[PDB]
Design a binder for these strands. Structure first.
Ligand SMILES: [Mg+2]
Ligand SMILES: [Mg+2]
Ligand SMILES: [Mg+2]
Ligand SMILES: [Mg+2]
Ligand SMILES: [Mg+2]
Ligand SMILES: [Mg+2]
Ligand SMILES: [Mg+2]
Ligand SMILES: [Mg+2]
Ligand SMILES: [Mg+2]
Ligand SMILES: [Mg+2]
Ligand SMILES: [Mg+2]
Ligand SMILES: [Mg+2]
Ligand SMILES: [Mg+2]
Ligand SMILES: [Mg+2]
Ligand SMILES: [Mg+2]
Ligand SMILES: [Mg+2]
Ligand SMILES: [Mg+2]
Ligand SMILES: [Mg+2]
Ligand SMILES: [Mg+2]
Ligand SMILES: [Mg+2]
Ligand SMILES: [Mg+2]
Ligand SMILES: [Mg+2]
Ligand SMILES: [Mg+2]
Ligand SMILES: [Mg+2]
Ligand SMILES: [Mg+2]
Ligand SMILES: [Mg+2]
Ligand SMILES: [Mg+2]
Ligand SMILES: [Mg+2]
Ligand SMILES: [Mg+2]
Ligand SMILES: [Mg+2]
Ligand SMILES: [Mg+2]
Ligand SMILES: [Mg+2]
Ligand SMILES: [Mg+2]
Ligand SMILES: [Mg+2]
Ligand SMILES: [Mg+2]
Ligand SMILES: [Mg+2]
Ligand SMILES: [Mg+2]
Ligand SMILES: [Mg+2]
Ligand SMILES: [Mg+2]
Ligand SMILES: [Mg+2]
Ligand SMILES: [Mg+2]
Ligand SMILES: [Mg+2]
Ligand SMILES: [Mg+2]
Ligand SMILES: [Mg+2]
Ligand SMILES: [Mg+2]
Ligand SMILES: [Mg+2]
Ligand SMILES: [Mg+2]
Ligand SMILES: [Mg+2]
Ligand SMILES: [Mg+2]
Ligand SMILES: [Mg+2]
Ligand SMILES: [Mg+2]
Ligand SMILES: [Mg+2]
Ligand SMILES: [Mg+2]
Ligand SMILES: [Mg+2]
Ligand SMILES: [Mg+2]
Ligand SMILES: [Mg+2]
Ligand SMILES: [Mg+2]
Ligand SMILES: [Mg+2]
Ligand SMILES: [Mg+2]
Ligand SMILES: [Mg+2]
Ligand SMILES: [Mg+2]
Ligand SMILES: [Mg+2]
Ligand SMILES: [Mg+2]
Ligand SMILES: [Mg+2]
Ligand SMILES: [Mg+2]
Ligand SMILES: [Mg+2]
Ligand SMILES: [Mg+2]
Ligand SMILES: [Mg+2]
Ligand SMILES: [Mg+2]
Ligand SMILES: [Mg+2]
Ligand SMILES: [Mg+2]
Ligand SMILES: [Mg+2]
Ligand SMILES: [Mg+2]
Ligand SMILES: [Mg+2]
Ligand SMILES: [Mg+2]
Ligand SMILES: [Mg+2]
Ligand SMILES: [Mg+2]
Ligand SMILES: [Mg+2]
Ligand SMILES: [Mg+2]
Ligand SMILES: [Mg+2]
Ligand SMILES: [Mg+2]
Ligand SMILES: [Zn+2]
Lengths: 50, 52, 83, 239
RNA sequence: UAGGCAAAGCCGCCCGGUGGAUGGCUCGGCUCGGGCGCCGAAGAAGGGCGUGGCAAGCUGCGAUAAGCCCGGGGUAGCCGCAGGCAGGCUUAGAACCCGGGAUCCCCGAAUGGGGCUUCCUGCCGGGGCCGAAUAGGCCCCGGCGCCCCGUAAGGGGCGGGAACGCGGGGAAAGGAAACAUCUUAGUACCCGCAGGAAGGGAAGCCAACAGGGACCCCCUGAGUAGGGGCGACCGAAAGGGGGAUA
RNA sequence: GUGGGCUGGAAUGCCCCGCCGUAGAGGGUGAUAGCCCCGUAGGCGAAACCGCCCGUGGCGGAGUCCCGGGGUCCCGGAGUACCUCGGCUUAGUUUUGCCGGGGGAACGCGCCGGCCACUGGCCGGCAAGGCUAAGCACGUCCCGAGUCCGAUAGCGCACUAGUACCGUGAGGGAAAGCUGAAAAGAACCCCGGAAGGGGGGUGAAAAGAGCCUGAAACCGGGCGGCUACAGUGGGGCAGGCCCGAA
RNA sequence: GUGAAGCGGGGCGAAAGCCCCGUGGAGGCCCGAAGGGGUUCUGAUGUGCAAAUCGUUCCCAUGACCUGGGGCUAGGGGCAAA
RNA sequence: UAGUAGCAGCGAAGAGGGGUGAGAAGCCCCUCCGCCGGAAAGGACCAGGGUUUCCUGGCAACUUCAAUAGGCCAGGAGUUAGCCGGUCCUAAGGCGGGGCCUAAUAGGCACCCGCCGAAAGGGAAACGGGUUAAUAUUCCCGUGCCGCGGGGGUAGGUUCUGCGGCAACGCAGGCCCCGUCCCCGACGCCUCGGGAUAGGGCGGGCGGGACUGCCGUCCCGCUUAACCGUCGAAGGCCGGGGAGUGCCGUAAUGGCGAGAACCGGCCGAAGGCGGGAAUAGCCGGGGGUUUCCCCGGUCCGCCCGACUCCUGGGGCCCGUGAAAAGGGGACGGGGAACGAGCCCCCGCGCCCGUACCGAGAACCGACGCAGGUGCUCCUGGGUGAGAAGCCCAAGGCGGCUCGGGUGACCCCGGGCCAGGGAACUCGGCAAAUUGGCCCCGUAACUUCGGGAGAAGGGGUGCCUGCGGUCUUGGGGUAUACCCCCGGGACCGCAGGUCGCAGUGGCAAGGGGGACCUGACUGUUUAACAAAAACAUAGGUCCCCGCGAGCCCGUAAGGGUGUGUACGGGGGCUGAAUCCUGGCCACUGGCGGUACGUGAACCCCGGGUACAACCGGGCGAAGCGCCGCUGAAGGCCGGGGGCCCUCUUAAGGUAGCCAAAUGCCUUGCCGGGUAAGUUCCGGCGUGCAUGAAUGGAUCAACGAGGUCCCCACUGUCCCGGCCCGGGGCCCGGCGAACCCACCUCCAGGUGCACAGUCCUGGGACCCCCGACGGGGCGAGAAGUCCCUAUGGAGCUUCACAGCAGCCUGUCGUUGCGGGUCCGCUUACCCGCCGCAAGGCGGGGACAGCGGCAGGCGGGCUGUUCGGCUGGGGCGGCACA
RNA sequence: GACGGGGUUGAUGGGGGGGCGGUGUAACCCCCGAGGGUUUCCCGAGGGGAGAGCCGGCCCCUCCCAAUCGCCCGAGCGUGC
């Protein structure tokens, strides 16, 4: 929406900050054991209930 | 009409928002209390023994 | 502000700019003019178009000014002089 | 589920309530009016059965009264025991001469007016019994009752008579009237329902019901409710 | 005539691909026994958001944010899960463990008032800033919940906790080879209220002419007496032996 | 004991020789360890915080304490005991407890109980005010144990699980463990647009990060037998081709 | 598109009145886009574009009209032109 | 299965050349071709989404194909406000504290207090230009505005008042505080006159562009914000005037001694114009460099004109179309000596939102889904009645994200078809016919409105002239008329002429007669029923005088009710019109003197040292009994002689009919057909029609059901040819259903319908296309039927039970006098009050609690047996 | 898929020329044209003459272009009755 309340906006900000895979050096550090993040999502598929 | 066409109308409204006390998407904005923890109608935390 | 412009509360005014574009300006409607407390007719001297509140309007130079029309005042004074 | 329509009305759902915010205020006597006043307005009030007069007293008190037929804006009316029995005046009932048509009759002093308030109705002052402060009046239904002699009535008949003689020619016309009233519009006959929804609902050839006693419980007490009789024979015995 | 001699197709073995069974492993589970047992207006539990040089999650922490101070243990390594790239910290004693402190955002009993967005906003008192100004405005800090006790100063209750405890409200399914009394069951569940346990407890008792001697819990009395469409089924108490003893 | 020899990439294994034991519970370490290491039997220990016990100390009261005599005067708990009606409950039965409606005592020369009520006798007691340790319930948590399970099992979760995720919501909720002793994690050459392929290396073994073992179904290739005039699978007998090392 | 009440003129006429033309702009009026609905082909689709759709033909379309936002009514209960 | 289906259908699509790149039909650029253009498509934007936005790079995965592309992946970046919204206000409504209720609460709310409640209502104040990769009323430039506060000047004031005008009213109209009142805020629908602006067009001019066969036409630019000032149409008002032989009017209604004409004035829109402001922007011509500088133009005269904005007139309502914050004014009271609403000048304006999509790929529907949400709001030219369709701009798209070849069958969607013309079929289903506008003309019937576009007949193109009715400006003495010139609208006449066809495409009624049925418009089974069902206006009956009636709640209390018989509630009927018969036995309801019966309490007796217990008395409602009631549920037959009579009362009246109601039955007689089980018209001891259970009844209306007639046609005789997409073949992606194994044919046999058994007959094997006979083909633990000591819901005369209501009794219940009277203080009801308490009415009644009887399918739980040539009815073969 | 014809020693497809055919008479030019005007050299729907013009998934003739270059299959041997 165009007209957002700040509280909702800050929950959207948190989801934006967490939506990313582990860095490449983490994959190296863990010998490829850690390659995915549970916070990884796509805006079209996994919907936030914000 | 009750199936797919009527699902089209669930695109814009809401019954619940996030509850400030428990954080779930369960605060009934019209009733003004949380369906999960009871915030807004009960100062004690809602939890029933029939729930695991 | 878009559904607010779909209602007819504001005037839709189309204007051409010095840049050559034709735009729509959404403008306020005039407020109603002061009315006589007895007849409800607009009072003389105060029926100018006003588009916002907070603007001082001068009342005519007469007792009870912009409250009743001259006709109501004269008749009421005639009643009181006798009574 | 199974509760019938008359039972659901008592819950006071929105579709059964009166939209009284559409009106300017109750049409009742204030408790302490006296002296002379002026009719300053005569108004249509949505959902009411008669035009309403706004009266301003000398001390600035304003109240709504049903307008007597013939009442006019600017008329001077008189309130109190000293008031002559002229149309639009508000008098204690013990002061109104016998044979006078009155309306908006209080049953007890200060109740604001209870009887003969619909358009075209009036009550007749039949007698006076002042040794116990009672006035005898005939109500629009023909019933004769006693009222507090200190209670107030207005002289004349209620204006707006003859409204019901013109037919509501269309369904839509009554629909708009109903929206200013509390009525649920429209109504479904009991025999047009299935048995779960009405005592009359059901059979292959649907029928009405025989009368129920006065002791019948809610949900059973529909149709004829402890009726003395029915049909043309009841009217004949009524006479 | 059969063989050289072969289509598509069939069966079997070997090798490979796919798959992830089997076997071995186990810093996980489960059951039993023993201990220990309350936290919160000094603002809890829970939640949101943030926090790392490169850091998304978990874990920890709270704008002093995988951490700050003091002491004890522990001596040479350290910078969580987590084996990378850097740069540092540490023999002026770190990391780590234990005790005591500091910091501790927003929401939360949440308590100035709101809250359709975990954010917004008021008054009073003090302070700062913009400003020519002592005006006006803006910002920061503190107080301002309800119901009570108390003369007042002051003080109390509120919310949470895996189960257990006390008072109240209170079913049906099923069983009776149907079903209603009945049972299931004073159960499930709901409402209220406590503690580390609760409740009970000191004879208007039990007995039978002989005598026991507050209470709770365990073993027994006993499926006995008794209740019951005398059906299904339900079901003591005194007495006796113990734990403990006021 | 890290002693001699053997096998081995590596010994804790085998052969021979020693030793400790109040310690042969158990674990780790390049394969199977009493003596290599942690530990175990056993012993010692706290600046600080907390708990328990003992000794000692400070203080207050109206003799309230012990024994004997005298008393026959005063006190000793009310909508209570009890009756009746309705109802829930109880083994409580003409006899359990209670709640509600109505009625409703007495006073120690009195009142209550002794399985229907009343009377007499005898026996036992003193309701309607309050407290009370110990001995008993439970498991978020801590410790120990195990004819328990061993990754489709065992808690839903051995893992960035109450997670990802599903439902408007109340609620619901997975899948997913294993390189090697050591990264020695594959240099270098050729080809490819690249994923990658060939050669050549590391290692005891590719066990190659898509990582222990690596079954079947399934698919590809090779090999044996059949294959276009003959109706199918299974068994017996006779034969052809092929295998027939242990 | 039709053309109610009301209002002009003309014609016939003894009076009443009747007739023609105009003006006027009523109505849960008519035809018909938008919008709303959902009749037929028993059309297409029927492991669909779709757990109810598409084409065609249709019904209403100034009103008991269609539609956004906010609000109220909750399970033996609601709400129902049923 | 299978390299198979699908990647078609919903009215767009690509092609050539070049570049990039390992690789190009698909990425980038130009050219050509197409689609939208009141929009599945352009402009804006809410919710929802939440980074999808922008830049750079990339192609393992993701996109129904490809890819160097991307809403994908990796890395980086991006959202700027006193004036745009929130914020403020109140609406319908909601929440919290207090109180009252509750076993209790986190349950209820009539009361008191407070607050919340709209990003479409009310409501302070910003516009234009420029700029970025991405924000723009937010940044920058220019020009302003609002609120609050201050300084200076001025008017004004300093006991006391501002001045002018006959007036309407005009004009800088002192300062501070407080109060009250009024007004604005503040309001529907329909219709018709007037004024503007946006937009569009025509002629001329200047500049620029398009094209080349001929002509020389065609296209583009020529703009002007907020803000300041001034002017002000309608309407209203003031002064003069003083009118009935009337006089003045409108689009229409019309106006006047209750004051007309006419004259003069006052208040008074949108918007115009100047200032802003040409210095901007645009167009054209040059020079730089990184977006800067210079030069020229930015004009003249007309027309149309909104769906946008303003104004006024008229009408409609059993419908009357919010409130508050805030603001303005007036009228008062108090204070100071100073001091403004005017002019200059100074200061301050917090917090949150702000990217992007806004949907045939950013929302919801598991999807990058033909649905839904939102076409929610806006849209140029030509044709045209049109916001229709068709064609084309501005602007966008070729991404409703497979391509190519072939031109069998068959399928889906289209076109045409000689002669016949419904012979097809349940049925004219489908298709066809008709179709716009103008003229002429139009029946039965009718509720007099209608029927009606009834029906039916005729006209329609293009060209050449000649006219008319208006309109809009200008010029003529010149406000109307008249003449001249420019523009616009509509209508007519004469002549010429072409086609098969002139509403030539597009767009666009087939018509008529009759019956049944519901009066009509309306509503309905979201997903098999749209109807004759529901509703409806109208009719009628019942409960009710308000402390009512009916309904909700455990209670406190509530709805109807801000109400009051022209009203609230409850039934039945269903417009209008003519009508609406007889019956109170039954099932209900209601009323009633006496009598019988009828519970608890109570009283009397017996019994019991007391009780338990036993008998009697009294006896409420109710029931029995007696009456009333049919627009209460309904019923309406025989026998006998208009009369009597029987059965549970009466005995089917007016009407109507083989009915949507008649079995027999294709009833009988007529109509219509060559032939009519249907239909229409009559007939009627009518299996079993009939009166608000509504009867009769069709004007108008109908996506209702039916028959006949005309027209019409590929429905058919009877089939043929063509078009687009599937199809088939190639390239690419690549499933599912189903599957014990897998099956040539005949005649048998068998759990009686065999791929597999028996006896025969055949077959070289493999592959492709097609079909739907078989595989008792696939789908779905058969819904039919029965069984089960299985359910659910519904009914009542089932077995029981519980509320609710009525009735008695115990308590509340007190005080005086002789079961009766009175009283008020209890208690109850209403008014006033914040509360305290007061006033009025009722009154030991009522109300409330316990107990008892009655009514009680309103609600709860259950039972509704078995045998049985299936079940059921019967029977009892059940002892 | 197949089948049939031709393949340079050749008319197999195309091109070109000719035949036959469909439609209906193009362009240009000349004449007539209801009427109007820059008066009769202009406008003007349309009519006439000569010329048709366009077109052919048919036939003939003519090597002008292309039927090319190429890639494959293929018996052959033993044995017994
Ligand atoms: Mg989505
Ligand atoms: Mg549903
Ligand atoms: Mg909602
Ligand atoms: Mg608004
Ligand atoms: Mg407005
Ligand atoms: Mg209503
Ligand atoms: Mg029905
Ligand atoms: Mg019923
Ligand atoms: Mg009944
Ligand atoms: Mg019935
Ligand atoms: Mg083969
Ligand atoms: Mg916390
Ligand atoms: Mg708070
Ligand atoms: Mg607590
Ligand atoms: Mg069980
Ligand atoms: Mg049972
Ligand atoms: Mg049962
Ligand atoms: Mg204890
Ligand atoms: Mg205790
Ligand atoms: Mg029990
Ligand atoms: Mg050791
Ligand atoms: Mg005692
Ligand atoms: Mg598991
Ligand atoms: Mg395993
Ligand atoms: Mg492996
Ligand atoms: Mg061998
Ligand atoms: Mg209509
Ligand atoms: Mg159908
Ligand atoms: Mg179909
Ligand atoms: Mg199909
Ligand atoms: Mg229509
Ligand atoms: Mg296909
Ligand atoms: Mg098109
Ligand atoms: Mg395409
Ligand atoms: Mg087009
Ligand atoms: Mg259009
Ligand atoms: Mg759009
Ligand atoms: Mg992008
Ligand atoms: Mg990019
Ligand atoms: Mg991304
Ligand atoms: Mg608010
Ligand atoms: Mg943008
Ligand atoms: Mg021009
Ligand atoms: Mg007009
Ligand atoms: Mg934006
Ligand atoms: Mg798509
Ligand atoms: Mg364009
Ligand atoms: Mg294709
Ligand atoms: Mg034909
Ligand atoms: Mg036929
Ligand atoms: Mg036939
Ligand atoms: Mg048809
Ligand atoms: Mg058409
Ligand atoms: Mg109808
Ligand atoms: Mg349906
Ligand atoms: Mg349907
Ligand atoms: Mg009906
Ligand atoms: Mg009628
Ligand atoms: Mg009836
Ligand atoms: Mg009748
Ligand atoms: Mg008859
Ligand atoms: Mg009839
Ligand atoms: Mg008949
Ligand atoms: Mg018939
Ligand atoms: Mg009958
Ligand atoms: Mg009937
Ligand atoms: Mg009948
Ligand atoms: Mg009828
Ligand atoms: Mg209809
Ligand atoms: Mg047989
Ligand atoms: Mg078979
Ligand atoms: Mg096939
Ligand atoms: Mg079955
Ligand atoms: Mg079944
Ligand atoms: Mg049985
Ligand atoms: Mg009483
Ligand atoms: Mg009672
Ligand atoms: Mg029942
Ligand atoms: Mg039985
Ligand atoms: Mg049976
Ligand atoms: Mg039987
Ligand atoms: Zn919550």
């Amino acid at each position: 929406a165009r007209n957002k309340p700040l509280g909702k906006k800050l929950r959207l900000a948190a989801a934006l900050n967490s939506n990313r895979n582990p860095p490449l050096w983490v994959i190296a550090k863990t010998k490829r054991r850690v390659t995915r993040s549970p916070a990884r999502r796509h805006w079209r598929r996994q919907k936030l209930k914000a | 009409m009750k199936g797919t066409p009527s699902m089209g109308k669930h695109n814009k409204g809401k019954t619940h928002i996030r509850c400030p006390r428990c954080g779930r998407h369960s605060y009934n904005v019209t009733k003004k209390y949380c369906a999960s923890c009871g915030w807004g109608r009960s100062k004690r935390w809602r939890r029933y023994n029939w729930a695991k | 502000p878009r559904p607010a412009y779909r209602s007819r509360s504001l005037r839709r005014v189309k204007v051409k700019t010095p840049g050559g574009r034709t735009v729509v300006h959404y403008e306020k409607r005039a407020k109603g003019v002061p009315k006589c407390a007895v007849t409800g007719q607009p009072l003389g001297g105060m029926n100018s178009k006003v588009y916002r509140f907070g603007i001082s309007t001068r009342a005519p130079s007469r007792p009870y000014g912009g409250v009743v029309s001259h006709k109501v005042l004269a008749r009421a004074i005639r009643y009181a002089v006798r009574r | 589920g199974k509760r019938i329509l008359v039972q659901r009305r008592g819950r006071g759902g929105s579709q059964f309530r009166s939209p009284s915010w559409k009106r300017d205020g109750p049409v009742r006597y204030p408790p302490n009016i006296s002296g002379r006043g002026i009719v300053v307005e005569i108004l249509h009030e949505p959902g009411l059965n008669a035009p309403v007069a706004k009266i301003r007293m000398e001390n600035g008190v304003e109240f709504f009264n049903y307008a007597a037929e013939g009442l006019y804006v600017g008329q001077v009316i008189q309130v109190g025991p000293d008031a002559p029995p002229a149309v639009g005046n508000v008098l204690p009932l013990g002061k109104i001469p016998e044979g006078t048509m009155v309306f908006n009759v209080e049953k007890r002093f200060g109740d604001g007016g209870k009887f003969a308030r619909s358009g075209g109705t009036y009550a007749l002052v039949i007698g006076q019994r002042p040794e116990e402060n009672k006035t005898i009046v005939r109500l629009p239904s023909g019933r004769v009752i006693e009222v507090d002699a200190r209670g107030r009535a207005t002289i004349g008949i209620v204006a707006g008579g003859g409204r019901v003689e013109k037919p509501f020619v269309k369904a839509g016309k009554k629909y708009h009237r109903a929206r200013a009233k509390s009525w649920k519009y429209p109504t479904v006959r009991g025999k047009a329902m299935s048995p779960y929804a009405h005592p009359h609902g059901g059979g292959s050839h649907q029928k009405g019901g025989t009368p129920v006693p006065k002791t019948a419980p809610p949900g059973q007490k529909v149709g004829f409710i402890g009726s003395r009789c029915t049909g043309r024979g009841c009217v004949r015995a009524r006479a």
